[PDB]
């Protein structure tokens, strides 16, 4: 390469980014560095796309059947001691404010159910938004993910440059 071309007389001065190494200095003397800069790891950045509908569907089906069954059974109980019932249920679901003893307990339990389900939904949304896919794929040479040469994650140096020398000059 370039080092051999320089050693063969085909070159006299190299003005290019060249990492200083002991092996290179043993044959070609170097000058004062322009600036200090190490080597890092480059990984493509992906934007996650996962929106809470695909998270669960069984819970949605269960609540959708539960609202209807509790509404019809409580309306039957009230009649003992339809379109109007479903309209009232939808209105209460929208706003708890309305706009013998069975009505009070019905309102209390339905408001509690709405509060707990909305709290769970908000907590799940917040948790899944703060714990999404992270861009952190490596932290350094000591990162465990870098250690394993698994075929799933393929990574290698471009050529026989100073990275190869640094890898060869490691005890482990």
């Amino acid at each position: 390469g370039m080092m051999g071309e320089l050693l063969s007389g085909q070159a006299d001065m190299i003005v290019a980014p060249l990492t200083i190494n002991n092996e290179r200095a043993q044959y070609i003397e170097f000058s004062k560095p322009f600036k200090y800069q190490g080597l890092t790891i480059l990984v493509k950045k992906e934007i996650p796309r996962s929106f809470m509908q695909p998270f669960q569907s069984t819970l949605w089906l269960l609540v959708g059947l539960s609202v209807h069954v509790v509404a019809v059974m409580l309306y039957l109980l009230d009649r003992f001691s339809l379109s109007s019932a479903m309209w009232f249920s939808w209105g209460v679901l929208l706003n708890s404010g309305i706009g013998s003893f069975s009505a009070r307990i019905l309102g209390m339990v339905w408001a509690g159910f709405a509060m707990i389900i909305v709290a769970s939904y908000t907590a799940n949304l917040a948790a899944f938004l703060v714990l999404d896919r992270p861009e952190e794929r490596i932290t350094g040479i000591n990162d465990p993910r870098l250690r394993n040469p698994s075929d799933k994650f393929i990574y290698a140096t471009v050529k026989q440059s100073s990275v190869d020398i640094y890898f060869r000059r490691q005890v482990c």
């Binding site: 819970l59 003992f80 069975s102 307990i105 339990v109 159910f113 707990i116 799940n124």
Partner: peptide, 25 residues
């Protein structure tokens, strides 16, 4: 979550108990 299912089903027992109480009374 399994914990959320148990938490939301805990109040169903109380609701049905209250419904039975107000039906029998």
């Amino acid at each position: 979550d399994i914990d959320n299912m148990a938490g939301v089903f805990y109040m169903l027992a109380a609701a049905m108990a209250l419904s039975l109480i107000t039906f029998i009374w």
